[PDB]
Amino acid sequence: SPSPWDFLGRVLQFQHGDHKRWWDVLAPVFGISMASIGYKLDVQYRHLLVLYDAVIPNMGPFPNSNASNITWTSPFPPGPLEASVNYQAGESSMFRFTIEPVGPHAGTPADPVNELAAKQLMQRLGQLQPGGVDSTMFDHFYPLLCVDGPEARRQWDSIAHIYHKCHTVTALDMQRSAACTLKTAFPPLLRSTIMNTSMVDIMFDAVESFRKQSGLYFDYTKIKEFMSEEKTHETMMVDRSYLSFDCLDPAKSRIKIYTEAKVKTLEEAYSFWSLGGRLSGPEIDYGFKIVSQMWDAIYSKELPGGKQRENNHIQINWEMSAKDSSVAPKLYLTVIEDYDAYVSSAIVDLFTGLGWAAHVQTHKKIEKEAYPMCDANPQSTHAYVWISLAYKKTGPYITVYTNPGASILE
Amino acid sequence: SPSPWDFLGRVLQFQHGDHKRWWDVLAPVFGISMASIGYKLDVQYRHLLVLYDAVIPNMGPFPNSNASNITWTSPFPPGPLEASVNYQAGESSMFRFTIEPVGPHAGTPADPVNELAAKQLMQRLGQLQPGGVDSTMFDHFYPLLCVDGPEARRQWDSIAHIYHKCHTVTALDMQRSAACTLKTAFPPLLRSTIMNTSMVDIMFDAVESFRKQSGLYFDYTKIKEFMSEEKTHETMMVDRSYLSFDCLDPAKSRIKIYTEAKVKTLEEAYSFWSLGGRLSGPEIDYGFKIVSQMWDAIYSKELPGGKQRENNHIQINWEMSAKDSSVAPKLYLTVIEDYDAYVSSAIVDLFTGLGWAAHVQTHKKIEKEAYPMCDANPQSTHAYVWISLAYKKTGPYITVYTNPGASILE
Amino acid sequence: SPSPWDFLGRVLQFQHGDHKRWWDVLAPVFGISMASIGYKLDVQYRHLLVLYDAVIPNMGPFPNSNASNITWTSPFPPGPLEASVNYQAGESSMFRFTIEPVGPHAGTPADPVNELAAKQLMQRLGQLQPGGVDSTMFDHFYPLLCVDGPEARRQWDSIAHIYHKCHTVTALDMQRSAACTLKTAFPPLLRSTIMNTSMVDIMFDAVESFRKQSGLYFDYTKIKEFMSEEKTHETMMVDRSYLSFDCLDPAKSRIKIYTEAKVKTLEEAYSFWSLGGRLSGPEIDYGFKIVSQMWDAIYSKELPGGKQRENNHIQINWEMSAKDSSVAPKLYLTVIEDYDAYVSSAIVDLFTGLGWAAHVQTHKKIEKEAYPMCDANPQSTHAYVWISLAYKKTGPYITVYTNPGASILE
Amino acid sequence: SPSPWDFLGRVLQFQHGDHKRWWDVLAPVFGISMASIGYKLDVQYRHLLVLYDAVIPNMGPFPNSNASNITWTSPFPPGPLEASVNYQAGESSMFRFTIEPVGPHAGTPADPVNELAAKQLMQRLGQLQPGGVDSTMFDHFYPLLCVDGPEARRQWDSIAHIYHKCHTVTALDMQRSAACTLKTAFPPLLRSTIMNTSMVDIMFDAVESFRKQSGLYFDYTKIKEFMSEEKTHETMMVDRSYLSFDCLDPAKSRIKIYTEAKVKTLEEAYSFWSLGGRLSGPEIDYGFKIVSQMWDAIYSKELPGGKQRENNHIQINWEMSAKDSSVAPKLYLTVIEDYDAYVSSAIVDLFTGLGWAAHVQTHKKIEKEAYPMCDANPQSTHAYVWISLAYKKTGPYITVYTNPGASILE
Numbered sequence A, B, C, D: 001s002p003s004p005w006d007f008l009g010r011v012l013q014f015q016h017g018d019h020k021r022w023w024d025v026l027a028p029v030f031g032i033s034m035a036s037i038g039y040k041l042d043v044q045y046r047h048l049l050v051l052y053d054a055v056i057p058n059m060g061p062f063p064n065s066n067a068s069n070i071t072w073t074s075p076f077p078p079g080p081l082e083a084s085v086n087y088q089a090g091e092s093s094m095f096r097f098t099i100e101p102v103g104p105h106a107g108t109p110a111d112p113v114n115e116l117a118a119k120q121l122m123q124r125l126g127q128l129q130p131g132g133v134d135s136t137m138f139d140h141f142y143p144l145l146c147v148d149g150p151e152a153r154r155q156w157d158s159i160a161h162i163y164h165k166c167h168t169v170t171a172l173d174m175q176r177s178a179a180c181t182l183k184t185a186f187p188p189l190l191r192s193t194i195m196n197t198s199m200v201d202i203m204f205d206a207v208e209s210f211r212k213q214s215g216l217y218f219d220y221t222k223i224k225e226f227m228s229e230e231k232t233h234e235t236m237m238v239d240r241s242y243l244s245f246d247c248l249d250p251a252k253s254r255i256k257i258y259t260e261a262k263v264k265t266l267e268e269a270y271s272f273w274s275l276g277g278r279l280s281g282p283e284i285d286y287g288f289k290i291v292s293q294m295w296d297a298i299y300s301k302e303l304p305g306g307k308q309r310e311n312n313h314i315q316i317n318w319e320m321s322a323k324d325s326s327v328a329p330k331l332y333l334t335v336i337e338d339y340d341a342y343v344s345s346a347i348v349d350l351f352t353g354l355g356w357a358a359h360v361q362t363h364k365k366i367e368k369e370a371y372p373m374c375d376a377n378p379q380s381t382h383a384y385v386w387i388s389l390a391y392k393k394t395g396p397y398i399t400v401y402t403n404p405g406a407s408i409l410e
C-alpha cells in the first residue's frame, strides 16, 4: 500500500521537472507532517494536490548543487522559509507553510521584482476554492505598503542597493478541514526607500487610513510610540520589518506588525515583548517567563566548534484585532546555527514541562521520519530554524519552524 | 465542498484533450457508481487517478458529433463496452468496467490491429501496483489464441473481410480495497480465420496444452461435446465467441468460454444454459427459472415504435475452475433496443423480487444521478445494454451493464 | 511533406485542450498568412511556437456551440479581435494579430477584471526574446490610464454597469525577422468612470505628464481642441476610445489616440480625418479621397436581406511622434455586416486600381486557403470585419482585418 | 538569436523531467552535428522535434550521479550507444544515431525484457511520417530471431544468467531531407539460448526461410562456411553477434550479419574482413590496407597510465544485398580506452592523408563545440568509442562513433 505522496508521484503528470524535484523533497515532509497528526488520508490527497497545483508551480527553481540556477537572491536557502507545524492545547496541531512566491524567472530582467507570483498564487487558490479568498485588505494595503511592477521599475536606482527585495510573503494554513487559508505579509522596505520615509509612519498611516475607510478598530498607537523611541531603535534593526493580515472578511482578519532585534540580555529583550512597558497584562508576564526559560536553556549550550555567541537573534510580532482595543506579542528565538540534538532536546523537555507528551511523540516521530539527518549525524544543525513562543488567553503558541529542504543541505 | 471528480478535473493536468473530454463524460458516472455504494473518498481518488492514468489514455479518441474521428470500427459505440456495477447478496455490490483497449491510432496504418494498447495498459497497471499482475496464463495463451502484430500483418488478406478485429478485451475489477484487478478475454476469430480451423478446436486445444503444461484441472469436455453439435450450431453464432481468464496466480484464475445466440423460445435457450442437458445440477435450473422470468418480463413489452420482435439476442458464458471439476453458466439478455423505462421497471421489480431493496435504492440513485435522460425523456433507450444473470452456490449474479457514454447519445 | 502547423499539431504537447482547439482553428489561418507572403519555414516554426507558447495560453476558453463557456463578455465574438495582414507599397506585407488577453477565468469571481493575462503575456514574451520588451511607457501610463486589480475591486459599484470592461489590448507584430513586437492600448473608460472625469482630460493629462517627465515631444494640442467640441461629440461615441503605444525605446515609440463615429455623409466624416480642419496637409486629403472612394464603393451595395443602412460605422486613430511635431490620422470602415463577396470585390478592385496585383493574388490566395466559406456559400458575411485606410508619407496603409475564427461561425 | 535547441528548450513542454535532462545533454550535440554540416534550420527543427517526440521518450531514465536509477543493466553507459556522423567522398556527411530503446521501467518486474519500447518507437515514428516505415522484414524475422515478452517470461530460467538482455537495437538515419529512416538489428542470443541451438544456425535458417518465402536473393553461404569453423571460433566471441535489416521495401533492404573479435595481429584479423579468404575481391584488400594503417597508427601509442595492451578489440559486419549475389565487410576498431588527443590526431591525419580537409574542419568544429573536454583536459578518453572502416565501390565508409553523453562522464 503506497502512501499518498508515493502514489501521486507515480501517477501525476508534472508541468515542469523542477516541480517534480520539489515534490520529491517537500511532499514527503509535508505528507508526514500531515499523517503524523492525523490529516485524513483524503485531506492529505487534497492538500497534496493543492501543493502540486498552487504552491510548487509558484516556488521558483530547485536548488542545484552549486545553487547556480537560483537567481532571486536571499539570505535564506532557496525554497520555503519554513514548514510551520504548530502545537496548542488539547492536542490541536496544524500544518502551516510560509513561502516567498518566486516566479520561475524572478530576479531576472523578465521579472526583476517578482510581481506576478503572489497574484498567480492568490488567483489559483481562489479558483480552487471559490469564495475562500476575500480580497478587501489586500486591495486597501497593496497601494500603501507594497510596490507594483511599474513603480519599482521606474525607481530602480532607489532600491537596487537592497539585497533582499522581498515585498509579499504568503503563508498557507493547511486546515485539517481541507480548507486552506491564505495570509499575506507586506514588508514596506522598498516603499519606505523610494518614498524616503520611515517604516514606522508609512505602516501606521496605512493602518490608519484603513481604520477610517473601514470604521473598524485597530489600536495602533502603543506600537508606534514604542518603536519610535531611541533606545529601541539602537538595538533592533527596523528595516527587517513587515506587517501582515489575513485575506478574509476584514471583520475577521488581524493586523500584525513584525520586526527583528539582536539583544544581549533577556531583560533587554523584555522591551520588545512589552513594547517598552506600555503593553502589559496578566499574560504578558506568563509568556515572557517561558521565553526566558527556553532562552537560557538553548543558550546554555555552546556553538558547534567553540565559536562564541556575542548577542542573540530574536524576532517579534504583535497583532491588533478589529473588534477590541488589544494587541499581543509573539517572540522568536532564531536557532539556525545550533545543535539540532540540543535544539531537539530543549524542545522535547520544554514540551515535557508542559506535559505535551502526545506532542512529544508527535515531534520525535516527525523528526525521525521527515528528518533522518538528526540521527545519522551527531553534529547536526539543519532541521530547525526558529523556535517561536507566544502566550494567549488559554495557552502558549509554540511553533517549531523547520527547513523542509534540509535534505538539500546534506 | 467539491467532489473528487470535480476537484480533480480542476487540478489535474491532462496529457491530451480527449482524455479531458472522456474525463468529463465518464468520471461523473464512475465516481457516482463508486460513491453510490460507499467507495471511501480516498479510494475514489485512487481509482479515479488510475482511470486518469491507466485506462483513459488507453481508450482511443472521443466521439465527435458525426463520430468522424473514430477510425477503429465496431458494431458498438465508442468508449467502454459497459460500466458494470454488479450486485450480490448481503448487499455486496462492486464496480467493474470493460474496455477494448484502443490505441490513439488503432485502426489506422500505424496500428492496424491495435496491438500495443492492451500491453501498455497491462504494464502501466503493474507499474502502479507492483506484484499485482501475474502474467502466467497471458504468457501461455497469447501464442495459441491471440495474434500478434507481425502475424496479423503478414496474413492481412485473410482477416481483412472481418468487420470487428477485436482480439483482446480487458475488464477492470475496481475493488473497494483500491486494488484493481485485470481480466483478459481472447476471441480467436482472427486466429481461427488465418489458421482456417474451427473455433472450438483451437480454443480447447489451447486449454488442453495449458492443462498438461500446468498440471491444473480444467474440465472442458462437456462444453466441447455440446458446442460441437449441429442443432446448436444452427441457432448460435459461433464467431461471436471468446474465452477469458484472470491475470493472477493460475492456481486462482478461471477459464470462461463465451458465445452468443439468437433464440426463439426460452425452452430452446435452455440448451446454452445447460450445454444440451450435459451441464446439469440443482443450480442449473435455479438460474434458468429466473432468466425465463425476466425474459418474459422484459419481452412482454413492445419495441419503441411498434417494430416487431422476431427472436431474442442472448449471450452465454461458461466457466471452468482449476481445483475442481465443474463448469457453470451465465446468461445475458441484450436490451440495447428497449424502453429504458421498461428495462428499469423490470430491473427494479426483479430486484424487488429478491428483496434487494437497498440495491433498489442504489439502482435508482445511480440512475437519476448518473443518467438523467431516463427521466428527462419518457421515450428513452440508452441507459442499459445488457441484463446478465447467473446463479452461483449462494446467490444470483445479476449485473446491469450500462453505457456510461449514453450522454453522448443525446 | 506536412506543413508546420500540421506537423506541430502532430508532435506538440498542449498544456490544455482549449489550446489544442484554438490551434486547430487559428494555426491554419496564421500559418497560411505567413506562408502566403513568404515567411521562411523556420520563421514559421518560430512564430507558431510563440503562438503556441505565448498568446494561445493567454486567449481564454474556446467557443463551444452555445458559447456557454465564454464568461468574459464582449460585443465581439471570442478569440482575436482580428488577424490583420497589412499591405504597403513595394510588396511589403506583414502579419500582425490583435488580442484582448483573457485569463482562463477572466470575467469570473477569481479574475473579475482580467488583470494578469496582459502581464503574463508581456513577461512570457520577454522571456522568449530577452531585451526585446522595453517597459518604460507601460510603467508611466499603467498608473494614469489603466486600472489595476485592487483599485477596480474597491470601486466595483462604479464600473459594474459597463458591458465591456476592456482595459488592455495587445497587438503582436509578427515580424518576418522572427522578432515579434508587442503593442499595448489603454482604453480609459473604467478610469474616467471611477474618477468621474472626462476621457479627453485624463488621456491628455497622462500624455502631458509623460512629456514633462521624459522631455520628449508629443504634440497633443490639436486633438484636444477638436475632440473637446460639441458638434464632434454629438456624432462620435467618445467612450469607445483608447490611446496606444509601443513597448519599446520611448525615443522610438508613438502615442496613438483612437475613437469611433457613426457618420451620415463622407463629408461630415472628413472632420475626424482632419480634426475639424486643424489637422491638415498635402496627405490629409490624399487619404481622404481614397477613403471616400472605397466608402461609396462598399456602401453602394445593399445589406444582405434588404435591411436599410441608416448611418455608417467608422473608426479613427490619430498618431503623435516623439522626434517631431506631427499627428496623422487612420480611418476604418466597419464591414462586419456586409457581403463577403462584395467586400472582397471592393478590396480586390481597390487593389487593382492601386496596381497591387501581387497583393491581389496574395489576397485571393489567403482567401481561398484560409477562408473557404466565401466560395462554399454565395451569401457570406464572416470573413472580413474592418477595412482600414491611412496615407503616410509614401503610400497608403490599407489593412484588411479578418476574423480568423470565422470557421467557428459556420 | 537563439539556436533551435536553445529556443526549443525554452518553449517546449516536456512530458517528463528526464526528457528535459536528456534534452539538455543530447540536443546540443545532436543540433551541433546537424548545424555543423549544414542541416537546414527548419530541418533541424523537424529532427529535433522528432528526437523530442519519438526517441527521447524511448531512451529510459537519466543517469543520476551514482547511477542508481539505471535499472536496465548494460556493459555500456546509459543513453545512445553512439552518435554516429558518417563521412563519405564528395563531402557527403550524414547524421545517424543508435539507441537500444529502453522503456521507462525496462529491467524491472513491470518490463523485465524491454518489450514495448522498440514497437512504441516504431509506431510513433510511423505516425509522424505515414508510409515511411515498411514492416515486412520485421514481420518475418521477429518470430525467428527475436523473443517476445511472453516467451521470454515463460523461459526466464534459461536466459537469467545473461548480463545484457538486448534483443532489438534501433538506428535512426536522420536524413538531411527530414525523412528519418529506421534500422533494426536482432541479436539472437536469447533465442539461441532458450532453443539451445547455435547462433549461426538460427540466423541462417531465418534468412533462408525469408529467401524462400520472398524469392529474393540473399547469398549467405560463405558467411556460414567461415563462421562455422573452429580457428575462427577460438578467437572471436560468437555471442556478441546480431543480424540487421532496414524497415523498408524488402526489395530495397539489406541483411547485415555482425560479430566481434579479440585479435592479436592485423594479419590474423584479415580473416574476419575476408571470411577466411572466401570473401575476396579488388575492394576486399583496399579496405584492409586502410584498416591496418589506422590500426598500427592508433595502437602504436600507449594506454593512459602505462597499462599494457595484450590484444585488440575489433568488430565486424558483413552485408548481403537482395538484387545481386554479393556480401561486403565493415570493420571496427574499439577505442573506448584511448587518448582522445591521440584518437583525434589519428582521425584527423587519416582524413588529411585522404584529403578530406572539409571533413577535417567539420570534425574539429564538432569536437570543440560538442565536446569541450578534449581541450579542457589533456588526459581525456571520453569523446570517441569506435572508429569504423569499410571500403565500398567508390570510397571508404569511415564512421566516428562518439558518446554524445560524454559530458555525463565529467
Ligand SMILES: CC(C)=CCSP(=O)(O)OP(=O)(O)O
Residues within 6 Å of the ligand: A084, A096, A098, A169, A170, A171, A183, A184, A185, A244, A245
Ligand atoms: C504572514 C506570513 C507571511 C508570516 C506569518 S505566519 P504565523 O504563524 O505567525 O501566523 P499566526 O500567528 O498563526 O496567526
Ligand SMILES: CC(C)=CCSP(=O)(O)OP(=O)(O)O
Residues within 6 Å of the ligand: B096, B098, B169, B170, B171, B183, B184, B185, B244, B245, B399
Ligand atoms: C473477461 C472480460 C473481458 C469480460 C468478462 S467480465 P465478468 O463480469 O463476466 O467477469 P465475472 O463473471 O465477474 O467473473
Ligand SMILES: CC(C)=CCSP(=O)(O)OP(=O)(O)O
Residues within 6 Å of the ligand: C096, C098, C169, C170, C171, C183, C184, C185, C244, C245, C399
Ligand atoms: C495598439 C493595438 C492594441 C491596436 C492597434 S494595432 P495597428 O495596426 O493600428 O498599429 P500600426 O498602425 O501599424 O502602427
Ligand SMILES: CC(C)=CCSP(=O)(O)OP(=O)(O)O
Residues within 6 Å of the ligand: D096, D098, D169, D170, D171, D183, D184, D185, D244, D245, D399
Ligand atoms: C542496425 C543498427 C542497430 C546498427 C547498425 S547502424 P550502420 O551505420 O552500420 O548502418 P550502415 O552501414 O550505414 O548501412
